[PDB]
Design a protein around this nucleic acid. Structure first.
Ligand SMILES: Nc1ncnc2c1ncn2[C@@H]1O[C@H](COP(=O)(O)OP(=O)(O)O)[C@@H](O)[C@H]1O
Lengths: 98, 97, 102, 67, 79, 66, 75
DNA sequence: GGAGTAATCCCCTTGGCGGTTAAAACGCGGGGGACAGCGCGTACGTGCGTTTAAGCGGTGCTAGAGCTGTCTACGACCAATTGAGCGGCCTCGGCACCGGGATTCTCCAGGG
């Protein structure tokens, strides 16, 4: 949902954790650099993504937990989205919170 | 450092750039200039698809013809390269207004 | 066909309707409404020969807009007809001045 | 829909039997042929109105002066 | 949602001069030809907006560019 | 045109310093432009169903090109 | 009027135009308009070549000055 | 029994980003382009003693010109039939810029 993506930003501003998002909230020259920013370890803890744009066509390996919010038309896509968190750099199980 | 006389390597530049259908205008910002021109006064254009190429090639025709006329007026004077005064000669005689 | 009256082959029906109703003359009175198609056939044939010669050369078999630009700038009658036109998808006539040149 | 291309290739067979051409040349043919048609129609419109005689000679004069 | 120009190249303007028959350069080659471009285009669009504001009507298909530029003084073919 | 007419033209003639050059040049395209205009007039008057040049058939001689 | 007198230009026009069509004739008009148009073109070329000479850092125009004046005026 | 209300399709935008290369510019070396003053002379400067022509004005009609009866010579409707190339497809000949191979384009520091 767009109205959730435009609301999570103020929550992040209030709670004051370093964050960045794989969504429609960056600039033209902050796409590959941000991809390597997630790929490289850092102090970040919040990465916001979409259901089918940044959650299927990427290779995120620096994540541990998955948070869903909703799924209208996805008979077998949410499992793939959960798997997208998983990678060979995940020595621990993929926690799920819903 | 194989640094040779400029003008002859500029001559090979001319030879490379004056041989094929290469688009010498690195010119999508030419398209943005066209957009600024078009939306300067009106809006809701709703034009065709490849019309940008045609208008840009007309721009190339005008500007390049100006270039050759300016170079002819420049070699007319004692200055081979492009000078603004030569361009004034090339444009005023055309009936600019 | 409806066009083979004098060696022509372009469609006639819609062309007959347009030339008869050209909205420029009251009536084409004896009268060459098919002469537009005649000059059309002439231009088509000359373009055919020129394009065949151009495509067959350059060790290819296709017409690049460069070749058509060269052909358009080549002719003198076309230059006298409308000399204020340019061809796209190509380049300008190559030029270097001996004074520019070292 | 309607294509002059078949007639054009008929004339080509009259000239050259087995030659292939490009589509961009066909589009330029369309544009230039049609603008020649417009110019030739425009030139020979009011010539019959130059004097009180209002044919073939109109378009003949058109091609005589444009060429 | 509007974008504007940044200077019209050292390189691409140089190739424009290259096909204009230029090898070296003066200090009056890059910028001014674009100024002539702007003046001519502003004149032709001035005529066009006069035409479309006198009667207050829109335009038609891509056949306009060849006719308008022919009246302007440099038209194009290609299609 | 002769020497005195060209002399007056050069008297206008950018402080007269351009005399000889215009004396040599301005007569080259005189006949060319005259031939062009008279050929255009002949072509315009060709379709007149008359036998002599009349102003009736040359009103729109250069209507094609202005 | 006619700085070059009417009779010289009339003689030149008749001599040049006699080759196109036999028995060509003019009415009372079409006598002084040709020279006037020619001189108008000449004065326009003079203005253009004067501008070019102003650029050329020499008041004296030349062959090439008039060539540039004629070529870039439209034809 | 066709339309009034309104539940449906849906697709198209209003807008913001991945991926992205070109777009303009830097940047150093220098050497060719930048633009002109002088040399002097040649390149024009010019104004009054010396004539053909130009633009005409003295008759009589004098090559092309506008001229009104009453028309000769033709070019565009409809109605049942029908053929040209179009309505759609993609067939066999010949493609289409850097490689196998590198002599050209251009300058420079010693042979000379
Ligand atoms: N055997 C493997 N070893 C290491 N990495 C692998 C292996 N198989 C797949 N991957 C990684 O998993 C990713 C899955 O790619 P793919 O599903 O095609 O697209 P996306 O990464 O967008 O989901 C790849 O980017 C690849 O790097």
């Amino acid at each position: 949902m767009t109205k959730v993506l435009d609301v999570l930003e103020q929550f992040l501003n209030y709670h004051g954790y370093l964050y960045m998002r794989l969504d429609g909230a960056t600039k033209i020259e902050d796409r590959q650099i941000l991809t390597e920013r997630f790929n490289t370890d850092s102090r970040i803890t919040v990465f916001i993504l979409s259901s089918r744009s940044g959650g299927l066509g990427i290779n995120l390996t620096g994540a541990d937990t998955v948070i869903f919010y909703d799924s209208d038309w996805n008979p077998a896509m949410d499992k793939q989205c959960q798997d997208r968190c998983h990678r060979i750099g995940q020595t621990r199980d993929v926690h799920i919170y819903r | 450092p194989h640094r040779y006389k400029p003008g002859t390597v500029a001559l090979r530049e001319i030879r490379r750039f004056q041989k094929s259908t290469e688009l010498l205008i690195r010119k999508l910002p030419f398209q943005r200039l066209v957009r600024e021109i078009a939306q300067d006064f009106k809006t809701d254009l709703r034009f065709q698809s490849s019309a940008i190429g045609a208008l840009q090639e007309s721009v190339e025709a005008y500007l390049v013809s100006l270039f050759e006329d300016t170079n002819l007026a420049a070699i007319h004077a004692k200055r081979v390269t492009i000078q603004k005064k030569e361009i004034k000669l090339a444009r005023r005689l055309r009936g600019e207004r | 066909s409806r066009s083979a009256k004098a060696g022509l082959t372009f469609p006639v029906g819609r062309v007959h309707r347009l030339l008869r109703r050209g909205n420029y003359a009251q009536r084409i009175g004896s009268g060459a409404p098919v002469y537009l198609t005649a000059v059309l056939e002439y231009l088509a044939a000359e373009i055919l020969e020129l394009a065949g010669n151009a495509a067959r050369d350059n060790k290819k078999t296709r017409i690049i807009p460069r070749h058509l630009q060269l052909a358009i700038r080549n002719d003198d009658e076309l230059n006298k007809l409308l000399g204020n036109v340019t061809i796209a998808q190509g380049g300008v006539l190559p030029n270097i001045h001996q004074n520019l040149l070292p | 829909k309607e294509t002059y291309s078949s007639y054009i290739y008929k004339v080509l067979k009259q000239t050259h039997p087995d030659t292939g051409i490009s589509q961009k040349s066909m589009s330029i043919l369309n544009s230039f042929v049609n603008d020649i048609f417009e110019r030739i129609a425009t030139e020979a419109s009011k010539l019959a109105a130059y004097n009180k005689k209002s044919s073939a000679r109109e378009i003949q004069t058109a091609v005589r002066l444009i060429l | 949602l509007r974008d504007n120009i940044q200077g019209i190249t050292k390189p691409a303007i140089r190739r424009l001069a290259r096909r204009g028959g230029v090898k070296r350069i003066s200090g009056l080659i890059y910028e001014e030809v674009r100024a002539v471009l702007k003046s001519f285009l502003e004149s032709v669009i001035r005529d066009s907006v006069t035409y479309t504001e006198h009667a207050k009507r829109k335009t038609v298909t891509s056949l306009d560019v060849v006719y308008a530029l022919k009246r302007q003084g440099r038209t194009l073919y290609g299609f």
